[PDB]
From a paper:
Here, we used [name], a cyclic nucleotide-modulated channel from [name], to define a ligand-gating trajectory that includes multiple on-pathway intermediates. cAMP is a poor partial agonist for [name] and depolarization increases [name] activity. CNG channels are tetrameric channels where each subunit consists of a voltage sensing domain (VSD, S1–S4), a pore domain (S5-S6), and a cytosolic cyclic nucleotide binding domain (CNBD) that is linked to the pore domain via a C-linker comprised of four α helices. Meanwhile, membrane depolarization increases cAMP-induced channel activity, suggesting that voltage modulates the agonist status of cAMP in [name], similar to its action on other CNG channels, although the mechanism is not known. Cryo-EM structures of VSD mutants with increased activity yielded cAMP-bound closed states (identical to apo and cAMP-bound WT [name]), as well as four additional states: one gating intermediate and 3 open states with different degrees of opening.
Tyr26 is located on the S1 helix, and its hydroxyl group is coordinated by the guanidine group of Arg111, a conserved arginine in the S4 helix and presumably important for voltage sensing in [name]. Removal of the hydroxyl group, as in [name] [name], abolishes this interaction, which can conceivably facilitate S4 movement in the membrane. [name] [name] adopts two conformations in the presence of cAMP. The majority of particles (1112621 particles, ~91%) was in a closed conformation, identical to the closed state of WT [name] (RMSD = 0.4 Å) as expected from our functional data (Po at 0 mV is ~0.25). Importantly, the [name] mutation does not lead to any local or other changes in the channel as gleaned from the identical structures of WT [name] and [name] [name] in the closed state. In all three open conformations of [name] R120A, the lower two helical turns of the S4 helix of the VSD are displaced outwards by a small kink at Val118, allowing S5 to move, which creates space for the expansion of S6. This lateral displacement is not observed in the closed states, which show identical S4 helices in [name] WT, [name], and R120A. In the closed state, the bundle crossing is stabilized by an inter-subunit salt-bridge between Arg136 on S5 and Asp226 on S627. In both cases, [name] [name] and [name] R120A, the mutation did not lead to different protein conformations at rest but altered the relative stabilities between closed and open states.
Author numbering:
A (entry chain D), B (entry chain A), C (entry chain B), D (entry chain C): 10 to 65, 74 to 418
Write the structure that this text describes.
Amino acid sequence: TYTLVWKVWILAVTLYFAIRIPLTLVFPSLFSPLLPLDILASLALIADIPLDLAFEPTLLAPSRLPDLLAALPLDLLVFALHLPSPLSLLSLVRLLKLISVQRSATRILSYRINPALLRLLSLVGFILLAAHGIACGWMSLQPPSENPAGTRYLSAFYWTITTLTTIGYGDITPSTPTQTVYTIVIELLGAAMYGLVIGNIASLVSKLDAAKLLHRERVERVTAFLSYKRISPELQRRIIEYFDYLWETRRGYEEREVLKELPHPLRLAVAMEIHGDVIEKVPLFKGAGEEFIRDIILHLEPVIYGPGEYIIRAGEMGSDVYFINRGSVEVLSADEKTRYAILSEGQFFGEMALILRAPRTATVRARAFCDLYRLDKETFDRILSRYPEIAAQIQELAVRR
Amino acid sequence: TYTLVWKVWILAVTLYFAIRIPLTLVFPSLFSPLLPLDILASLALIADIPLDLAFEPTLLAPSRLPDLLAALPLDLLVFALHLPSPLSLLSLVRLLKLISVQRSATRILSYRINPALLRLLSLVGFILLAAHGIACGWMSLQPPSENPAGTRYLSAFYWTITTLTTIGYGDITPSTPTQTVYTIVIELLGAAMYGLVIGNIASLVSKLDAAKLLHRERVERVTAFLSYKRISPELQRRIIEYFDYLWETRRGYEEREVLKELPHPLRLAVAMEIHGDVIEKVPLFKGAGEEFIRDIILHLEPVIYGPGEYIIRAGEMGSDVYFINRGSVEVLSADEKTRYAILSEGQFFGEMALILRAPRTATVRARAFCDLYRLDKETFDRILSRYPEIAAQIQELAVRR
Amino acid sequence: TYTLVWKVWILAVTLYFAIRIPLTLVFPSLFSPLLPLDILASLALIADIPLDLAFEPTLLAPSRLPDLLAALPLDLLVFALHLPSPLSLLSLVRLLKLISVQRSATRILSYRINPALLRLLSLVGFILLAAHGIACGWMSLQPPSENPAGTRYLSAFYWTITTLTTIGYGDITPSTPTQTVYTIVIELLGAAMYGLVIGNIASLVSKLDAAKLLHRERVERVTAFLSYKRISPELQRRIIEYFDYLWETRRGYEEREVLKELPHPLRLAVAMEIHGDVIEKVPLFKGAGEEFIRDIILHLEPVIYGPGEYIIRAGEMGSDVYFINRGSVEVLSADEKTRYAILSEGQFFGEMALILRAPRTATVRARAFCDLYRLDKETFDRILSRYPEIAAQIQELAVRR
Amino acid sequence: TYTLVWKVWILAVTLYFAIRIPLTLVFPSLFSPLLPLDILASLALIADIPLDLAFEPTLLAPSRLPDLLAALPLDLLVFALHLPSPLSLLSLVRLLKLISVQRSATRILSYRINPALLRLLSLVGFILLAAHGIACGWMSLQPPSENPAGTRYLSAFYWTITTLTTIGYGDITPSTPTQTVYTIVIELLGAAMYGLVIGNIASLVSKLDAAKLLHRERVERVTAFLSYKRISPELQRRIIEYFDYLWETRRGYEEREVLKELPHPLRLAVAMEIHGDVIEKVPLFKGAGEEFIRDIILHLEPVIYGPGEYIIRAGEMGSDVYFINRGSVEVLSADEKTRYAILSEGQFFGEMALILRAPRTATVRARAFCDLYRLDKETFDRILSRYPEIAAQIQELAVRR
Ligand SMILES: Nc1ncnc2c1ncn2[C@@H]1O[C@@H]2COP(=O)(O)O[C@H]2[C@H]1O
Ligand SMILES: Nc1ncnc2c1ncn2[C@@H]1O[C@@H]2COP(=O)(O)O[C@H]2[C@H]1O
Ligand SMILES: Nc1ncnc2c1ncn2[C@@H]1O[C@@H]2COP(=O)(O)O[C@H]2[C@H]1O
Ligand SMILES: Nc1ncnc2c1ncn2[C@@H]1O[C@@H]2COP(=O)(O)O[C@H]2[C@H]1O
């Protein structure tokens, strides 16, 4: 962090020069009672050279020539020698340090803020600094007057702000050919700057809601298609409330498409974190090796059931086993008159299907949105074929009907 | 809804304060014949504290400190005691309730309107309210005059509107250093506000047509590729009219990609809704269990045939069976001189292919765009292998040639 | 088209009213030498009612009430009776026909133009028409003067155009409280209109190049990844020139992803159009049924070879057969000292691989970008298993070594 | 390049005409001491006709009529004959060459610059040129004055720049009906031009960061989903630092999705470039044919392991073999108390798994981010089935336990 405060000091010295140099060009009465601070400033700006050359691309580099062009005290010379106005503008080389400061900021602070906002903040800072420079430029090429320095600077800053925002009141206007040329030049500059601001704000806003518009558009697409297919309002309302649940819980993201941007080891660690509250107590995987567990966990597919949907129907063959994660379930009878149990988070049903293909013995209805994971029997057999010990033990559990 | 009218009352009291406080700061002649209504207002704004603390994150919360900062009657004190202008601006803490009102609106009404439009409406309301505040601020720092209150408020609102829209006529301009500083500040504010408005409008418009531009661009892509491949105008016109039919019926959405954003139970319910008018009367699935039906319905693939395309050619082996959904079909002979029948919505053809691989006995031509669903024979056998009873019955129907 | 000229006549009568009604409100000296044309206009606007009610949603419809609100001659009454200004503004109901005209245009002409440009054109037309209306409104509430009608209309249109574009010269300004309120209202309107124009232009431009930026970004992605992987400049230049060829020929579109947005019958017809110049003369598919041909054509995968790349290497086993489409090929010897032949568009090589897996007998080098299609041997066997006659004939051709 | 300098000469002559023609219409005192250069210019503009007709679509073409309309000396006639102002405006046909110049530029220079920036540069050039033309137009229709030509041109350019940027000071304003009509027309033109500039800048900025925002949004999506799934901060921090590594190394691009936009031969050449430092020294593929190597290289799947993750666990069966590319590895013992070796870039482990399925003999932990490639045993057997010699040799190496 001792570099991350020296960067702030460098920014402060750069903004000292970018506020003092033009204000001193217009007012030679300065630079006498400010010389020590700017000599300290020059020594600081030359002490940055070894503090970034020792930052583990040598001199005269396409990206490091601005730093050396701002490094040399090319001030302390024109003001000390009192060079005439036509040639003393080259004292402004110190302002080239702003480019290096901006490249620093666009990669140091560019971790915890939206880049389209960092760009806008940098642009606004540069606009304010350029407005100060333009105000000094306008105030330089005016007829001599005995008005104090503070008043005419206020008038100059007022004029440049009313020109750069493209408001243009018209109470301060050019009166001389050179003033007219200057005004044309910075009218073009102000139009460009304001266009840049509007473009940056439009780019910042055009992506301020992303998940919400993606979800909204997928819902519109689904509803248009089902309105074409002539589907009942009851089901076309069940689908709407399912999408409502999806948005309110996980911002509409699809589980299987999100958990696929991860590499295999992080994906496996996430899968263990999730199915760590279930798959240790299943009374047919008990005592199996950890690799069998790690093999049956990467092949669990999620599925969400709304309130009242049939998960399992009594009498049908069935082959799946379901693990409840974030919901609840009621086990009813074939005639649906008795409620055997209310399974909830952590528990599971359908366990007997993996052993043999006996028809289901009870019906299963969701009570709320369940958000549960299912395992097939084809997948279970496929990944059981590689573990002869557990496969033989399950075949034994099968031979008992 | 008794919360959804109290929110409206809270909005009304907040906008009462945000219109009365500055207008009373400029005009001390008020606050005498308005005190009861604003004391009712303060009691209402303090009765909001338990009506959202009992909303099932305690005091001094990063998102609930504005409410308590606007809650305390920090008005009723500066106006009653007639505090001087430099310090009485802290009476404006009541305006912080606007932030809580906006957070309320951006999630209560944020269900049935495009979020990019709700944001624009909130921004426009805030601009009007800030323009009132800025007009009062400008009207405060003017030389004393005997003009009535209504006239100078009209002039102040005129000036702030002609500054905030960046029009800037110039007939009302600063005449004092403090007025010039104020004008600079709100010129910057007006440029920012107008840039925000333009960005919001651009973001709202840049996605006003989505399905249409997606369809248009896929048609351009297809036509460019086939123009490269040197394909006849006849076929490159058949493709254009197919895309025309797709757009005019289902807005260009792909059937198999839309009906895939649904979970398995909702997808199965949609599939039953669609194929509920066909698969109950097929005279070889008759009497089969409901699970067999639910298994053959999830494996039907759609396909659209244009007017005059050959669906089935007499003599070829063939293995598929087609279900007509939203079109019509004519069954012709091998020599294509006799029209056996005109099948339409609900009916089906190719049924004998699933039984055995006898060559097709008649040709089939579309009459309009058909929009029909097909089932393979490999898929039919694959999902028939799991139902020995129906498989044996179909083998019996096969042994009769 | 006799409806598609009556729509133009309706547009002309609507724009006659939207230009005449305000200009007559300001100038009562009209409406005497213009009554017959507007009575014809009213009869035309009432003859539109049966010409769209007989357009194969009855009266008092949410989308057809503007037409009936503009239909009744609510003009011909205020001007004939000379109603006072406060109440005669309701004569403007005829302008509601503009909404129906716009809904007509946004679906009639909305086939052959970019919708983001049709929207902009409609917006610009509405802006010009509203500027005429606003000019008449401003010219109504002015002090009486003896200036001619043409001059004060020029001044009014000048003022409203310099206000709506947010330029605001300031040489024509309000001078009365009612003029100030009017100016505030249309300053807000002009800011909104100009923001709409800027948003529409930004949306129109932000998608003016699509294929080009997609291609450019995929090339940047590829080059960044290979620069990370430290790949030679020679190969990283071969890839660049391959992408150059892709862009210059088919605008960077991927063949297998474009020809997949088509249904199966159109895709098969396109495949026959493309492989119609090759697969009739292959001397082992000769005499096979048309269905075998239609089966081997849908399984041809494209592949592009740059200039000098090895397609087939002598000695390797190999299993594929390649069909030249849009390039050229030279067949060289194992020692690469003799050029046996120069195959070109239409011809094919590797034919003997499908029969048996004898090692390749000669090497094959591309001369230019080839753009050729390949067929496997696994796919060929898979789709040959369903044709016993052709399979037996090929086995016979195989038994001859 | 001798065409690529003649294009620059054509651009220079076109910009000579587009700066001289209006300035000569206003000032007839020119065209006497400039005739030779513009006669050279006309001969140059007529020498472009054969230098693009011989560019390997004949005369009177929809895209080449502007060139012939600018080709004929329709100047050198109105100025020589001194035609009156109403009809001499047709001398401006030379400016139509700008359209051909722009079509040239939008495909010659349109290779190494972002198209949205080339469009903006062309628009800005056209705006400056049109501002010169508009300044000349405004200066033509002014009352006669004895002011010098340079001064009134400065005033005219000042007025047109303050109108086109929508600043509108108001110190130069119309004073005549024709001046008012001209000012209205170019107020509309300036609003359109400035809207175009803002739209182009917004489009240029709205895609200035693409990889960064894609990466940022995928990280937000992942973190929101895992915050919903209630995953530990330790693992939800491991995932964040993995995404940090991905961004800092390869800009967040997915390896398997980037290296899939390439055709098969370029993909194979890239794969050899990458796995050229490993797969020549594996002591069981040694001596195998080059085709076996080229077959095992296209089936290597990448995977990234963070610092400390278990790649291989001692005791588990295991079937994979891993090739280290851009990281490091430490081989530890079953009790994890002894470090056998430190494998690094180029080396590989797990080689014995392909031979037989003996349990792993040591554990393997990453030391830094590894970025290594893995080969299965199912894939190895699948692609070994096609090489009987190498398969037999590996079976021999297997029969030695
Ligand atoms: N009495 C019960 N209490 C809780 N769960 C049950 C009960 N009876 C059956 N189940 C579960 O419901 C499932 C339905 O049939 P299965 O064969 O899939 O296996 C069954 C068990 O998992
Ligand atoms: N006379 C007929 N009327 C209606 N449909 C028929 C007739 N003859 C054949 N078909 C259908 O057309 C199909 C063509 O051959 P298939 O063997 O596929 O099965 C046939 C029936 O489904
Ligand atoms: N003399 C030749 N002229 C043209 N083509 C040839 C010649 N010899 C071999 N080929 C082709 O080159 C192929 C290389 O080996 P194949 O066995 O694939 O089949 C070969 C033929 O298709
Ligand atoms: N002493 C060692 N030095 C380096 N690598 C080893 C050593 N012992 C085992 N390995 C590697 O670690 C792997 C772990 O078990 P495998 O059977 O996969 O094959 C092993 C070798 O690839």
